[PDB]
Amino acid sequence: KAAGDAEAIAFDGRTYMEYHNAVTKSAEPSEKALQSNHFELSIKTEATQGLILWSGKGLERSDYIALAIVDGFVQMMYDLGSKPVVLRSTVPINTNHWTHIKAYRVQREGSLQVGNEAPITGSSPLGATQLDTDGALWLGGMERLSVAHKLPKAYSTGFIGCIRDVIVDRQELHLVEDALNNPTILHC
Ligand SMILES: [Ca+2]
Q: From the CA of 83, how far away is ligand 1's center (Å)?
């Protein structure tokens, strides 16, 4: 919890924070064509289903990369415009112990490592290599859930648990201060 070194934020199932890719070298409107994505974070949970993170514009047509707990295991999913790929971890996540997650994508190639497992790798189908996004990022849940009807129920399920030390594209997130949607703040 935010009361001893690492500030850990609690998520109650309705909690979700919006952030914007506000840190650089990791104008006006338009979009971004990202070659890569890098996510690192630690979570603590008893949940067997839940959306951890969603990066993308959040429209039905939009590209996305997301982390979710699906049937007790963290998985990464992304669709860059040539259909999605899923990378599924082998580490039970719902132990209620702080667990590290490292997930990244370079063009079509993805990697997911929970704890000390051998990284799970895979690639989205040949074609698109860039994630077209406005830079929006949601943690613990999502505003626009309709863009989850095409996915496992976990993606429409708010995360219940705690999160700390979130690093997005080489920048440590200030979970409380960086949040843009005035969420209800609770510590772990
Ligand atoms: Ca794309």
A: 10
